[PDB]
Amino acid sequence: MDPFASTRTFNLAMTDIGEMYFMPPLMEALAQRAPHIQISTLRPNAGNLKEDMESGAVDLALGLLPELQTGFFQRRLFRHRYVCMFRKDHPSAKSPMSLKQFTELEHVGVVALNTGHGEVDGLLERAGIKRRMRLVVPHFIAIGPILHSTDLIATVPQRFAVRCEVPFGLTTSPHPAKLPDIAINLFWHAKYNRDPGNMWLRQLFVELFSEAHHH
């Protein structure tokens, strides 16, 4: 069936950041290419996501999702690093920040339970980096106005940080801790590898967001 004929609803898993990044250009393109398709999103749910992708309840997932392993396929959209972010007139924070100073200032922690970002707190702690967690929030999206009004600092994905800098008057430093890359991928389950609708929507994601040729 041609894309214009499709009235299928595709269910897509992604974080708050992912929704702000992926949804505006996707829906813009869908209105031109397949205007009767419906999209619904949901936040990643580590308890349910694999099962939901196996059963076909969730069609695609986008983000840092290291648990989607055997039985899944992935295509790389881009990769980026964690950075330290803080307000631009912070009284003492500097770029490049020292590990000592990272460890002295107070933090907004981000739990990010159902994604690879949930690994950060344990990676720091096992390296023996103790942080004074003044505030802990579950997700990244509200970090910006919090850092603006305080002397707190945060460990944040670089592409999201860059989007926060001007609107909230923040700046960033390369991260002094050794943290892994953030690989942002498009995921699907092997059972839907040759489903024509899933294939078509995957190719659209690649066309709109893949930096394999770009960069």
Give the whole-angstrom CA distance, residue 117 versus residue 139: 10
Question: Binding mask 155-194 vs a second copy (x if CB under 8 A, - otherwise)?
Answer: ------------x---------------------------
CA-CA distance, 212 to 215, in Å (whole number)?
Answer: 6
What is d(CA 54, CA 72) in angstroms, rounded to the nearest whole number?
A: 9
Angle at 31 between CA 197 and CA 183, to 5 degrees: 60
- Cis geometry, peptide bond prior to residue 96 (ω within 30 degrees of 0): yes
Judged by beta carbon, residue 79 or residue 148, the one nearer a second copy is: 148
**Binding partner of 138, given ligand SAL, a second copy, none, CB within 5-8 angstroms per partner class:** a second copy
Convert residues 84-123 into a mask of x (bound to a second copy by CB under 8 A) and - (unbound): ----------------------------------------
Q: Considering only residues 123-142, where is the footprint of a second copy by CB under 8 A?
A: 133-139, 141-142
**How many C-beta atoms lie closer than 10 Å to residue 213's C-beta?**
6
DSSP symbol at 191: G
Q: How far is 185 from 211, CA to CA, in rounded Å?
A: 11
Q: Which residues bind ligand SAL (CB under 6 A)?
A: 1, 3, 6, 8, 15, 17-18, 21, 34, 63-64, 157, 159-160, 182, 184, 196-197, 200
**Interface with a second copy includes 19 (CB under 8 A)?**
yes
Neighbours of 149 (CB within 10 A): 9
Which of a second copy, ligand SAL, none sits in contact with 25, Cβ below 5 to 8 A by type?
A: a second copy
Considering the complex, state which of residue 6 and residue 171 has its C-beta at the smaller distance from ligand SAL. 6
193 φ, ψ to 5°? -50, -40
Binding positions for a second copy, rule: CB under 8 A: 16, 19-20, 23-25, 27-28, 30-31, 38-43, 133-139, 141-142, 145-146, 148-152, 167
